[PDB]
Design a protein around this ligand. Sequence first.
Ligand SMILES: *P(=O)(O)OCC(C)(C)[C@@H](O)C(=O)NCCC(=O)NCCS
Lengths: 99, 49, 72, 50
Amino acid sequence: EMENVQKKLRKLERDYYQIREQVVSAKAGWCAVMRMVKDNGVERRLHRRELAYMEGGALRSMSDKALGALRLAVADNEHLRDALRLSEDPKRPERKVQF
Amino acid sequence: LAYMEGGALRSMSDKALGALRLAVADNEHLRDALRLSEDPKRPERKVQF
Amino acid sequence: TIEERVKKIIGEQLGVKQEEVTNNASFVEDLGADSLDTVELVMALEEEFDTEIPDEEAEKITTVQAAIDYIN
Amino acid sequence: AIRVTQSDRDLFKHLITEATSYVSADYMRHANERRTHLDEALALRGELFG
Ligand SMILES: *P(=O)(O)OCC(C)(C)[C@@H](O)C(=O)NCCC(=O)NCCS
């Protein structure tokens, strides 16, 4: 029985190592993300801690709706428009901070 | 679209719906269809829209 | 080397400069690593040397000097 | 003067609210997900040790 259980233990070890590596990379990226907003964006505008209690789906959906509106809003300023359009790439998030 | 994950599809749908909300301020009918379809569990609604 | 891998890991897990991170640079004060930051720092340190640390032994570490000491 | 101030106030209100919504949302989702991943990793670590 114990050996059977240690099998699951080893499986869980592998899983935990994977999760550990993922969180390590996440923190590494978030460091630079923060150091962009660290320039006086964090306080009351870009960080909004009341939103801490919702999930990625809702946040992304409302973000997309906001962008659908804002792009029309930023129709004027070509470089600001370019920042918006480029940061539209979800894979490269801190762009949206710079925008 | 089978070759993309659900998250991308959801993002694209919402992004479209945003501009739709901006545009539809013109016509009551499309606005009503939108205001009924935007909920997730009513795909047919969106289709009618 | 280990004594510089430690600084690399600490820096890119806290964003602190290589210069700020001396052996005595305490994470919570000198490097401003808070609860979750400290946990993530120990996590990344464990990853760097693919080794695990006991919970009380891990939390005992609170300074670059102690971190290297346990690591080496 | 009233016209100038009203126009500029409305424009800044609109742009700020929209941009803040948009960008703070992605930021906060990143933060929440990182926290959730940390929580899951801690649970795994404790269960593994036990
Ligand atoms: P920070 O003030 O958010 O604190 C984070 C934490 C120190 C509470 C966290 O990293 C932690 O240690 N949680 C797990 C504590 C523990 O030893 N649990 C037993 C195994 S589940």
